[PDB]
Design a protein around this motif. Structure first.
Motif, PDB file in Angstrom:
ATOM      1  N   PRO A 186       0.801  -1.224   0.000  1.00  9.67           N
ATOM      2  CA  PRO A 186       0.000   0.000   0.000  1.00  9.67           C
ATOM      3  C   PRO A 186       0.845   1.291   0.000  1.00  9.67           C
ATOM      4  N   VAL A 187       2.178   1.195   0.140  1.00  5.93           N
ATOM      5  CA  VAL A 187       3.090   2.352   0.269  1.00  5.93           C
ATOM      6  C   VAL A 187       4.079   2.474  -0.903  1.00  5.93           C
ATOM      7  N   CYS A 188       4.552   1.355  -1.478  1.00  2.00           N
ATOM      8  CA  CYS A 188       5.529   1.340  -2.584  1.00  2.00           C
ATOM      9  C   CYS A 188       5.191   0.415  -3.779  1.00  2.00           C
ATOM     10  N   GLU A 189       4.006  -0.197  -3.764  1.00  2.00           N
ATOM     11  CA  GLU A 189       3.411  -1.002  -4.848  1.00  2.00           C
ATOM     12  C   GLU A 189       4.196  -2.273  -5.260  1.00  2.00           C
ATOM     13  N   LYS A 190       5.188  -2.706  -4.467  1.00  2.00           N
ATOM     14  CA  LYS A 190       5.884  -3.995  -4.653  1.00  2.00           C
ATOM     15  C   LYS A 190       4.911  -5.179  -4.516  1.00  2.00           C
ATOM     16  N   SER A 191       5.055  -6.190  -5.377  1.00  2.00           N
ATOM     17  CA  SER A 191       4.265  -7.434  -5.339  1.00  2.00           C
ATOM     18  C   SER A 191       4.791  -8.455  -4.315  1.00  2.00           C
ATOM     19  N   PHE A 192       3.873  -9.238  -3.740  1.00  2.00           N
ATOM     20  CA  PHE A 192       4.113 -10.315  -2.769  1.00  2.00           C
ATOM     21  C   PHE A 192       3.193 -11.522  -3.019  1.00  2.00           C
ATOM     22  N   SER A 193       3.687 -12.726  -2.725  1.00  2.00           N
ATOM     23  CA  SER A 193       2.986 -14.000  -2.961  1.00  2.00           C
ATOM     24  C   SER A 193       2.167 -14.513  -1.767  1.00  2.00           C
TER      25      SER A 193
ATOM     26  N   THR B  42       8.723  -3.913   8.561  1.00  2.00           N
ATOM     27  CA  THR B  42      10.155  -3.594   8.441  1.00  2.00           C
ATOM     28  C   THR B  42      10.444  -2.291   7.690  1.00  2.00           C
ATOM     29  N   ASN B  43       9.654  -1.968   6.660  1.00  2.00           N
ATOM     30  CA  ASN B  43       9.889  -0.834   5.755  1.00  2.00           C
ATOM     31  C   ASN B  43       8.911   0.336   5.972  1.00  2.00           C
ATOM     32  N   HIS B  44       7.702   0.076   6.484  1.00  2.00           N
ATOM     33  CA  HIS B  44       6.615   1.059   6.605  1.00  2.00           C
ATOM     34  C   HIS B  44       5.897   1.052   7.986  1.00  2.00           C
ATOM     35  N   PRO B  45       6.599   0.917   9.135  1.00  2.00           N
ATOM     36  CA  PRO B  45       5.958   0.685  10.437  1.00  2.00           C
ATOM     37  C   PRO B  45       5.027   1.816  10.898  1.00  2.00           C
ATOM     38  N   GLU B  46       5.373   3.074  10.612  1.00  2.00           N
ATOM     39  CA  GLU B  46       4.547   4.254  10.932  1.00  2.00           C
ATOM     40  C   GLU B  46       3.317   4.423  10.010  1.00  2.00           C
ATOM     41  N   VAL B  47       3.175   3.541   9.014  1.00  2.00           N
ATOM     42  CA  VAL B  47       2.129   3.540   7.973  1.00  2.00           C
ATOM     43  C   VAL B  47       1.185   2.325   8.102  1.00  2.00           C
TER      44      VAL B  47
END
Ligand SMILES: [Zn+2]
Length: 37
Positions: A13-20, A31-36
């Protein structure tokens, strides 16, 4: 009638990277977006 088989992919929801898997996008958000979260 009862529900059939299911499975899905996810996108950050913050950088649009895909995950499985749901655990992998949640690990990325923690890890990358904790305040979000
Ligand atoms: Zn991200």
């Amino acid at each position: 009638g009862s529900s059939g088989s299911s499975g899905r992919s996810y996108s950050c929801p913050v950088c649009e990277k895909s995950f499985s898997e749901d655990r992998l996008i949640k690990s990325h958000i923690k890890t990358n977006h904790p305040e979000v979260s």
